Amino acid sequence: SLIWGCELNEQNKTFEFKVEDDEEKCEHQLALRTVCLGDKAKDEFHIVEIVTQEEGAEKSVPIATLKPSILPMATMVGIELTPPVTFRLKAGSGPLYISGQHVAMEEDYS
Amino acid sequence: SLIWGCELNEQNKTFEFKVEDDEEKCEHQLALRTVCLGDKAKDEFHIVEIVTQEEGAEKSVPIATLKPSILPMATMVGIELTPPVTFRLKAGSGPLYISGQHVAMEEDYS
Amino acid sequence: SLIWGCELNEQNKTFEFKVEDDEEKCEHQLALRTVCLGDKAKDEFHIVEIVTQEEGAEKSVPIATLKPSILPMATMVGIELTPPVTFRLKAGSGPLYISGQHVAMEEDYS
Amino acid sequence: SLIWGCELNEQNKTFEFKVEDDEEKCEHQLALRTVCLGDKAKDEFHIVEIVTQEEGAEKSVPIATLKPSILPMATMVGIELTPPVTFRLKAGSGPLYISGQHVAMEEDYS
Amino acid sequence: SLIWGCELNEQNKTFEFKVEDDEEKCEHQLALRTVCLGDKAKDEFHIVEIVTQEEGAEKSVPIATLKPSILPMATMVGIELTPPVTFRLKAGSGPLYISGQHVAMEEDYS
């Protein structure tokens, strides 16, 4: 369980949890823990979602909704991602920081 | 675990998590994760429930209650649905978006 | 897991989760999920508790405390009741609706 | 799982979860569930902790922090005590009620 | 499960969960439970994080964000640390108290 974090904002509205092609050989995940508003986040309900594809029709996984006045930070426990997995802001301007741990296995290279 | 979402509102007060009859042959579920108020949701306590039937007397499963000022979004973890399962708004006007993952198994069609 | 709900208020200050004597033969439970204030609930901290008996001295299990302005609804996860189990309002006027699922096993009556 | 509750306040700043010496022969616990402010609690952040001893240097286990305006009640799930275990108010005046279930095993005395 | 707590503030912006080299021989952890603002904490969103190192590029694990007016205290359940693990305040002035239990095994020294 290496440890992972990123942000989504108007400057980084989209992101991606992707593991290196060499590293992707193993089973890799990203077990998310928390999502917290950034310093430049607007006072509105910013929504973090995932972008993927199903049956050719565009789709996304809503992850969280945050607002500094009510819910600036929430616990994203029970949410895991199998890389590659795109990140997007369904709503808001960010920065919405997403935390977690990149679960990655490594072979014996000794 | 394909990934799933819908909304309930005055325009869609009722919905249903149903898997296709061909797909229903396998064990299908919908493990819910979160429920979040929509952009057009009223500032009141909107309640999301499920509609089913027991012993011929009408019944529903209350899923969540949300309000933009207090609890616009909640985590619907530990809630799973076996399709078909109707959705309804016990109270409110919506849109109340319900998230989750449609757990579906597929046979080898190669 | 049949599904269950009730309310406690000045009209129903006390209630009971009881399974029928014929049904009680099996192991029956009521896994609670959520507790939500009713439409007629006062703007105060209404407390839901259970009534039982220990060593002959009167006792109760506090389940929840709710207020429309702060915590109108809470998740009563991890709380399970073995029938019969009385319900009472430690404080408040209700209606405080208690949700859950009545876990009940049935024999083969074919 | 017998069921347990107590309060800590200026009148009862300290308490203890202790099982009777005769009962202590078995493995006894107190799985805590919730902590809620009392009727006489002040509008400040009252902190509930445990008192014990380690390596001869005084120590305590902070359990919770509550305030009527923000967090009058919280879920103390995942917290278990092995009796005897002293209770104290790290901060506040109480009453802070602590809930739970005293898990106790009994031999066959028939 | 010995029991553990510390604080991070302008006076202690950095800390560390480290087990003694003699004690480190066994598998040691620190299962965190809660994080609560101190008496001298400013009315802003103080962020607690961990400091470590990955692939030579500096990094940290954000643990929590707290504010007395909204979220003075939160439950840090599901978070565990393998010593040594540095603590830092990503934002804020503290004191932000971090609770938990130091899980430590000891050999038979009789």
Residue numbers in the entry:
A (entry chain B), B (entry chain A), C (entry chain E), D (entry chain D), E (entry chain C): 16 to 125
Task: Reproduce the article's own wording on this structure.
In Xenopus eggs, NPM2 replaces sperm protamines with core histones upon fertilization, thereby promoting nucleosome assembly on sperm DNA Laskey et al., 1978; Philpott et al., 1991; Ohsumi and Katagiri, 1991. NPM2 can also extract out somatic linker histones from chromatin Dimitrov and Wolffe, 1996; Ramos et al., 2005; Bañuelos et al., 2007. The acidic tracts in the C-terminal tail of NPM2 binds H2A-H2B, histone octamers, and the linker histone H5 Platonova et al., 2011; Ramos et al., 2010; Taneva et al., 2009, while poly-glutamylation and hyperphosphorylation of NPM2 promote its substrate sequestration ; Lorton et al., 2023. Our cryo-EM structure strongly suggests that the NPM2 binds to H1.8 as a homo-pentamer.
3D DuSTER enabled the reconstruction of 3D structure of the interphase-specific H1.8-containing complex, a pentameric macromolecule with a diameter of approximately 60 Å. C5 symmetry was applied during structural reconstruction. Among the proteins detected by MS, NPM2 aligned well with the MagIC-cryo-EM result. In addition, the crystal structure and AlphaFold2 (AF2)-predicted models of Xenopus NPM2 matched the MagIC-cryo-EM structure of the interphase-specific H1.8-bound complex Dutta et al., 2001. By combining MagIC-cryo-EM and DuSTER, we were able to determine the sub-nanometer structure and structural variations of the NPM2-H1.8-GFP complex, in which the mass of the ordered region is only 60 kDa. One possibility is that the H1.8 structure in NPM2-H1.8 does not follow C5 symmetry. As the size of the NPM2-H1.8 complex estimated from sucrose gradient elution volume is consistent with pentameric NPM2 binding to a single H1.8, applying C5 symmetry during structural reconstruction likely blurred the density of the monomeric H1.8 that binds to the NPM2 pentamer. The structural determination of NPM2-H1.8 without applying C5 symmetry lowered the overall resolution but visualized multiple structural variants of the NPM2 protomer with different degrees of openness co-existing within an NPM2-H1.8 complex, raising a possibility that opening of a portion of the NPM2 pentamer may affect modes of H1.8 binding. While DuSTER enables the structural analysis of NPM2 co-isolated with H1.8-GFP, the resulting map quality is modest, and the reported numerical resolution may be overestimated.
